[PDB]
Amino acid sequence: VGANCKFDVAARTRTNEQVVRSLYVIYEEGDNIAGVPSDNDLSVLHLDSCT
Amino acid sequence: VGANCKFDVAARTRTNEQVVRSLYVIYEEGDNIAGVPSDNDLSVLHLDSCT
């Protein structure tokens, strides 16, 4: 209920991959919360080169 | 869960037709399993005529 979308929880074996559960997501577009690769300034800028 | 699609199980009366259940289908495209009209060589070929 109230979910915008759902993920597919699956079990991957040596031969196949079977979906067993659902994980529902409620999200709102914005910029207050950011997903980061890991815990640490997030502002890194490389200049005068391809990036 | 895990179903690609679902059929609609319905009861047909003399006046209307009402859906009461759902039958879910998990399928994979291929050629190993074939649905046949009845139990029996499935290769029949008519030549030199419209078919």
mmCIF file of all heavy atoms in Angstrom, chain B residues 19-49, unseen atoms left out:
data_model
loop_
_atom_site.group_PDB
_atom_site.id
_atom_site.type_symbol
_atom_site.label_atom_id
_atom_site.label_comp_id
_atom_site.label_asym_id
_atom_site.label_seq_id
_atom_site.Cartn_x
_atom_site.Cartn_y
_atom_site.Cartn_z
ATOM 1 N N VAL B 19 -15.643 -12.484 -13.130
ATOM 2 C CA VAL B 19 -14.329 -12.996 -12.752
ATOM 3 C C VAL B 19 -14.304 -13.251 -11.250
ATOM 4 O O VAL B 19 -14.731 -12.405 -10.458
ATOM 5 C CB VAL B 19 -13.224 -12.014 -13.169
ATOM 6 C CG1 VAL B 19 -11.862 -12.539 -12.760
ATOM 7 C CG2 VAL B 19 -13.276 -11.772 -14.665
ATOM 8 N N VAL B 20 -13.800 -14.418 -10.854
ATOM 9 C CA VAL B 20 -13.769 -14.799 -9.449
ATOM 10 C C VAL B 20 -12.376 -15.154 -8.944
ATOM 11 O O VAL B 20 -12.134 -15.049 -7.731
ATOM 12 C CB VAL B 20 -14.741 -15.964 -9.167
ATOM 13 C CG1 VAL B 20 -16.170 -15.503 -9.326
ATOM 14 C CG2 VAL B 20 -14.450 -17.134 -10.091
ATOM 15 N N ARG B 21 -11.447 -15.571 -9.802
ATOM 16 C CA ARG B 21 -10.131 -16.002 -9.354
ATOM 17 C C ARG B 21 -9.078 -15.580 -10.367
ATOM 18 O O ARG B 21 -9.385 -15.034 -11.428
ATOM 19 C CB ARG B 21 -10.078 -17.520 -9.139
ATOM 20 C CG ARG B 21 -10.773 -18.001 -7.880
ATOM 21 C CD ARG B 21 -10.082 -17.485 -6.636
ATOM 22 N NE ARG B 21 -8.710 -17.964 -6.539
ATOM 23 C CZ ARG B 21 -8.354 -19.087 -5.933
ATOM 24 N NH1 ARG B 21 -9.245 -19.872 -5.353
ATOM 25 N NH2 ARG B 21 -7.070 -19.432 -5.909
ATOM 26 N N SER B 22 -7.819 -15.843 -10.022
ATOM 27 C CA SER B 22 -6.683 -15.563 -10.889
ATOM 28 C C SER B 22 -5.771 -16.779 -10.925
ATOM 29 O O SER B 22 -5.498 -17.385 -9.884
ATOM 30 C CB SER B 22 -5.902 -14.336 -10.409
ATOM 31 O OG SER B 22 -6.708 -13.173 -10.427
ATOM 32 N N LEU B 23 -5.306 -17.134 -12.119
ATOM 33 C CA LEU B 23 -4.357 -18.224 -12.319
ATOM 34 C C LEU B 23 -3.089 -17.633 -12.920
ATOM 35 O O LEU B 23 -3.106 -17.142 -14.053
ATOM 36 C CB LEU B 23 -4.950 -19.303 -13.222
ATOM 37 C CG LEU B 23 -4.089 -20.531 -13.510
ATOM 38 C CD1 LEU B 23 -3.825 -21.314 -12.238
ATOM 39 C CD2 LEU B 23 -4.763 -21.409 -14.546
ATOM 40 N N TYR B 24 -1.994 -17.674 -12.168
ATOM 41 C CA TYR B 24 -0.756 -17.030 -12.578
ATOM 42 C C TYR B 24 0.100 -17.979 -13.405
ATOM 43 O O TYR B 24 0.102 -19.193 -13.195
ATOM 44 C CB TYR B 24 0.016 -16.546 -11.353
ATOM 45 C CG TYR B 24 -0.785 -15.598 -10.494
ATOM 46 C CD1 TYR B 24 -1.582 -16.070 -9.462
ATOM 47 C CD2 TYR B 24 -0.761 -14.233 -10.730
ATOM 48 C CE1 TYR B 24 -2.321 -15.207 -8.683
ATOM 49 C CE2 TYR B 24 -1.496 -13.364 -9.958
ATOM 50 C CZ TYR B 24 -2.275 -13.857 -8.936
ATOM 51 O OH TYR B 24 -3.010 -12.991 -8.162
ATOM 52 N N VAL B 25 0.832 -17.405 -14.356
ATOM 53 C CA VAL B 25 1.618 -18.162 -15.322
ATOM 54 C C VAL B 25 3.066 -17.708 -15.234
ATOM 55 O O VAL B 25 3.344 -16.504 -15.220
ATOM 56 C CB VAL B 25 1.083 -17.976 -16.754
ATOM 57 C CG1 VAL B 25 1.809 -18.900 -17.716
ATOM 58 C CG2 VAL B 25 -0.411 -18.215 -16.798
ATOM 59 N N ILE B 26 3.984 -18.669 -15.171
ATOM 60 C CA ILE B 26 5.415 -18.406 -15.275
ATOM 61 C C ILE B 26 5.913 -19.148 -16.505
ATOM 62 O O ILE B 26 5.882 -20.383 -16.544
ATOM 63 C CB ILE B 26 6.177 -18.845 -14.018
ATOM 64 C CG1 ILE B 26 5.631 -18.125 -12.786
ATOM 65 C CG2 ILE B 26 7.662 -18.574 -14.177
ATOM 66 C CD1 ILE B 26 6.344 -18.483 -11.508
ATOM 67 N N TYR B 27 6.375 -18.409 -17.508
ATOM 68 C CA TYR B 27 6.755 -19.009 -18.778
ATOM 69 C C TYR B 27 8.079 -18.444 -19.269
ATOM 70 O O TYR B 27 8.482 -17.337 -18.902
ATOM 71 C CB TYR B 27 5.672 -18.797 -19.847
ATOM 72 C CG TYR B 27 5.538 -17.371 -20.323
ATOM 73 C CD1 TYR B 27 6.168 -16.943 -21.481
ATOM 74 C CD2 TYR B 27 4.775 -16.454 -19.617
ATOM 75 C CE1 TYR B 27 6.046 -15.641 -21.919
ATOM 76 C CE2 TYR B 27 4.648 -15.152 -20.049
ATOM 77 C CZ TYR B 27 5.285 -14.751 -21.199
ATOM 78 O OH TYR B 27 5.160 -13.453 -21.630
ATOM 79 N N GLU B 28 8.755 -19.233 -20.097
ATOM 80 C CA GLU B 28 9.991 -18.831 -20.755
ATOM 81 C C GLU B 28 9.914 -19.209 -22.226
ATOM 82 O O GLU B 28 9.577 -20.349 -22.559
ATOM 83 C CB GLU B 28 11.212 -19.486 -20.101
ATOM 84 N N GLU B 29 10.228 -18.255 -23.100
ATOM 85 C CA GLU B 29 10.150 -18.495 -24.535
ATOM 86 C C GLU B 29 11.192 -19.519 -24.971
ATOM 87 O O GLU B 29 12.328 -19.521 -24.492
ATOM 88 C CB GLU B 29 10.346 -17.188 -25.301
ATOM 89 N N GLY B 30 10.796 -20.390 -25.894
ATOM 90 C CA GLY B 30 11.685 -21.441 -26.351
ATOM 91 C C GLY B 30 10.945 -22.409 -27.253
ATOM 92 O O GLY B 30 9.896 -22.079 -27.806
ATOM 93 N N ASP B 31 11.512 -23.608 -27.392
ATOM 94 C CA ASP B 31 10.915 -24.617 -28.258
ATOM 95 C C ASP B 31 10.970 -26.026 -27.678
ATOM 96 O O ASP B 31 10.648 -26.982 -28.392
ATOM 97 C CB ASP B 31 11.592 -24.605 -29.635
ATOM 98 N N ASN B 32 11.362 -26.193 -26.414
ATOM 99 C CA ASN B 32 11.492 -27.533 -25.853
ATOM 100 C C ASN B 32 10.145 -28.170 -25.532
ATOM 101 O O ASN B 32 10.001 -29.390 -25.658
ATOM 102 C CB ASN B 32 12.363 -27.497 -24.597
ATOM 103 C CG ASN B 32 13.816 -27.203 -24.907
ATOM 104 O OD1 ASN B 32 14.297 -27.490 -26.002
ATOM 105 N ND2 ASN B 32 14.524 -26.633 -23.942
ATOM 106 N N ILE B 33 9.160 -27.380 -25.116
ATOM 107 C CA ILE B 33 7.856 -27.882 -24.697
ATOM 108 C C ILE B 33 6.798 -27.314 -25.631
ATOM 109 O O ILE B 33 6.734 -26.097 -25.833
ATOM 110 C CB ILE B 33 7.548 -27.505 -23.239
ATOM 111 C CG1 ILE B 33 8.698 -27.925 -22.327
ATOM 112 C CG2 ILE B 33 6.248 -28.139 -22.794
ATOM 113 C CD1 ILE B 33 8.563 -27.419 -20.918
ATOM 114 N N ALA B 34 5.962 -28.188 -26.183
ATOM 115 C CA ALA B 34 4.930 -27.797 -27.131
ATOM 116 C C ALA B 34 3.556 -28.210 -26.622
ATOM 117 O O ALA B 34 3.378 -29.323 -26.122
ATOM 118 C CB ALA B 34 5.180 -28.422 -28.504
ATOM 119 N N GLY B 35 2.586 -27.308 -26.756
ATOM 120 C CA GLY B 35 1.206 -27.626 -26.443
ATOM 121 C C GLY B 35 0.485 -28.211 -27.639
ATOM 122 O O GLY B 35 0.447 -27.592 -28.703
ATOM 123 N N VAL B 36 -0.088 -29.399 -27.486
ATOM 124 C CA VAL B 36 -0.677 -30.114 -28.617
ATOM 125 C C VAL B 36 -2.177 -30.283 -28.400
ATOM 126 O O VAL B 36 -2.641 -30.268 -27.253
ATOM 127 C CB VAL B 36 0.013 -31.471 -28.824
ATOM 128 C CG1 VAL B 36 1.483 -31.267 -29.142
ATOM 129 C CG2 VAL B 36 -0.151 -32.346 -27.598
ATOM 130 N N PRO B 37 -2.972 -30.412 -29.467
ATOM 131 C CA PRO B 37 -4.418 -30.624 -29.274
ATOM 132 C C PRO B 37 -4.754 -31.893 -28.512
ATOM 133 O O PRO B 37 -5.710 -31.902 -27.727
ATOM 134 C CB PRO B 37 -4.956 -30.666 -30.711
ATOM 135 C CG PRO B 37 -3.937 -29.956 -31.526
ATOM 136 C CD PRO B 37 -2.621 -30.262 -30.888
ATOM 137 N N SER B 38 -4.001 -32.968 -28.725
ATOM 138 C CA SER B 38 -4.260 -34.234 -28.054
ATOM 139 C C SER B 38 -3.023 -35.112 -28.177
ATOM 140 O O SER B 38 -2.115 -34.835 -28.964
ATOM 141 C CB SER B 38 -5.490 -34.939 -28.638
ATOM 142 N N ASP B 39 -2.999 -36.179 -27.383
ATOM 143 C CA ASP B 39 -1.920 -37.151 -27.451
ATOM 144 C C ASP B 39 -2.015 -37.966 -28.735
ATOM 145 O O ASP B 39 -3.106 -38.278 -29.220
ATOM 146 C CB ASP B 39 -1.955 -38.081 -26.238
ATOM 147 N N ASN B 40 -0.853 -38.308 -29.284
ATOM 148 C CA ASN B 40 -0.790 -39.093 -30.513
ATOM 149 C C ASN B 40 -1.232 -40.532 -30.273
ATOM 150 O O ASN B 40 -1.891 -41.137 -31.117
ATOM 151 C CB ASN B 40 0.626 -39.069 -31.093
ATOM 152 C CG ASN B 40 1.040 -37.691 -31.566
ATOM 153 O OD1 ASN B 40 0.412 -36.689 -31.226
ATOM 154 N ND2 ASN B 40 2.106 -37.634 -32.355
ATOM 155 N N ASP B 41 4.437 -38.958 -34.673
ATOM 156 C CA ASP B 41 5.134 -37.889 -35.376
ATOM 157 C C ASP B 41 4.231 -36.677 -35.565
ATOM 158 O O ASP B 41 3.137 -36.786 -36.116
ATOM 159 C CB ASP B 41 5.642 -38.382 -36.733
ATOM 160 N N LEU B 42 4.700 -35.521 -35.102
ATOM 161 C CA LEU B 42 3.965 -34.270 -35.229
ATOM 162 C C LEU B 42 4.218 -33.562 -36.551
ATOM 163 O O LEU B 42 3.577 -32.542 -36.821
ATOM 164 C CB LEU B 42 4.324 -33.326 -34.076
ATOM 165 C CG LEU B 42 3.995 -33.785 -32.656
ATOM 166 C CD1 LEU B 42 4.531 -32.791 -31.644
ATOM 167 C CD2 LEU B 42 2.497 -33.960 -32.491
ATOM 168 N N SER B 43 5.128 -34.069 -37.378
ATOM 169 C CA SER B 43 5.509 -33.402 -38.620
ATOM 170 C C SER B 43 4.597 -33.883 -39.742
ATOM 171 O O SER B 43 4.771 -34.982 -40.274
ATOM 172 C CB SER B 43 6.975 -33.666 -38.941
ATOM 173 O OG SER B 43 7.805 -32.673 -38.368
ATOM 174 N N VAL B 44 3.624 -33.053 -40.104
ATOM 175 C CA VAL B 44 2.725 -33.307 -41.223
ATOM 176 C C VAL B 44 2.855 -32.142 -42.192
ATOM 177 O O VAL B 44 2.748 -30.980 -41.787
ATOM 178 C CB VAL B 44 1.268 -33.473 -40.759
ATOM 179 C CG1 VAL B 44 0.357 -33.709 -41.950
ATOM 180 C CG2 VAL B 44 1.156 -34.614 -39.766
ATOM 181 N N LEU B 45 3.089 -32.450 -43.465
ATOM 182 C CA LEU B 45 3.338 -31.431 -44.475
ATOM 183 C C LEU B 45 2.500 -31.727 -45.709
ATOM 184 O O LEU B 45 2.630 -32.799 -46.307
ATOM 185 C CB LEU B 45 4.825 -31.375 -44.833
ATOM 186 C CG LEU B 45 5.291 -30.170 -45.644
ATOM 187 C CD1 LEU B 45 4.926 -28.891 -44.923
ATOM 188 C CD2 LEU B 45 6.786 -30.241 -45.876
ATOM 189 N N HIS B 46 1.646 -30.779 -46.085
ATOM 190 C CA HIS B 46 0.866 -30.858 -47.313
ATOM 191 C C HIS B 46 1.534 -30.003 -48.379
ATOM 192 O O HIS B 46 1.828 -28.828 -48.141
ATOM 193 C CB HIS B 46 -0.572 -30.393 -47.083
ATOM 194 C CG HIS B 46 -1.332 -31.235 -46.108
ATOM 195 N ND1 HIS B 46 -1.955 -32.410 -46.466
ATOM 196 C CD2 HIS B 46 -1.567 -31.073 -44.784
ATOM 197 C CE1 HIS B 46 -2.542 -32.937 -45.406
ATOM 198 N NE2 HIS B 46 -2.321 -32.145 -44.373
ATOM 199 N N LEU B 47 1.764 -30.590 -49.548
ATOM 200 C CA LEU B 47 2.523 -29.947 -50.609
ATOM 201 C C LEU B 47 1.638 -29.656 -51.812
ATOM 202 O O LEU B 47 0.632 -30.332 -52.045
ATOM 203 C CB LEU B 47 3.704 -30.821 -51.041
ATOM 204 C CG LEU B 47 4.769 -31.127 -49.988
ATOM 205 C CD1 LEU B 47 5.844 -32.022 -50.574
ATOM 206 C CD2 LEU B 47 5.375 -29.846 -49.448
ATOM 207 N N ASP B 48 2.029 -28.629 -52.570
ATOM 208 C CA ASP B 48 1.400 -28.275 -53.844
ATOM 209 C C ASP B 48 -0.070 -27.905 -53.684
ATOM 210 O O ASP B 48 -0.874 -28.115 -54.594
ATOM 211 C CB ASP B 48 1.554 -29.403 -54.869
ATOM 212 C CG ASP B 48 3.000 -29.771 -55.112
ATOM 213 O OD1 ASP B 48 3.866 -28.882 -54.994
ATOM 214 O OD2 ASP B 48 3.272 -30.950 -55.419
ATOM 215 N N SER B 49 -0.433 -27.346 -52.534
ATOM 216 C CA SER B 49 -1.795 -26.892 -52.302
ATOM 217 C C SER B 49 -1.774 -25.851 -51.198
ATOM 218 O O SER B 49 -0.834 -25.784 -50.403
ATOM 219 C CB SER B 49 -2.724 -28.052 -51.930
ATOM 220 O OG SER B 49 -2.303 -28.669 -50.727
#
